[PDB]
């Protein structure tokens, strides 16, 4: 295990570019990280943005998030309007929680949960 609840990350999900997110425990399952059928680590993420988003990712596509200038280094190794926009909101609140620890991360920014 490379990350705990409140870390964060980058992460590629889909067609999505690097997005940063935090590593939050998934709400059904009551773990933030796992092991595949195959043997691989993965772990459970939220994204920020302005609309909640979370998924399951696996270890080689979760990076350590340490500044938003990296976001190029990532680029050089491998968008619509609405989800540019809901990027760089993000970004905003990624650069924001970089100042923050672990501990204030998680009760700032973890998703609330309804059962409906």
């Known amino acids: 295990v490379k990350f705990q609840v409140g870390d964060?990350?980058?992460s590629k999900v889909g067609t999505y570019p690097w997005?940063?997110?935090?590593?939050s425990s998934d709400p059904q399952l009551e773990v933030h990280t796992k092991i595949n059928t195959r043997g691989a680590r993965e772990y459970h993420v939220q994204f920020f943005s302005?609309?909640?988003?979370?998924?399951?990712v696996h270890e080689?596509?979760?990076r350590e998030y340490k500044?938003?200038?990296?976001?190029?280094?990532?680029?050089?190794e491998a968008?619509?309007?609405r989800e540019r926009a809901q990027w760089d909101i993000g970004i905003a609140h990624a650069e924001k929680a970089l100042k923050m620890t672990r501990?204030?991360?998680i009760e700032q920014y973890t998703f609330i949960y309804i059962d409906k």
């Open 79 to 81: 968008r619509p309007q």
């Open 60 to 62: 080689k596509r979760v």
């Open 19 to 23: 997005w940063p997110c935090m590593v």
């Open 67 to 76: 500044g938003h200038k990296q976001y190029e280094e990532l680029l050089a």
């Open 50 to 56: 302005n609309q909640p988003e979370r998924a399951w």
């Open 103 to 105: 501990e204030e991360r």
């Open 8 to 10: 964060l990350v980058w």
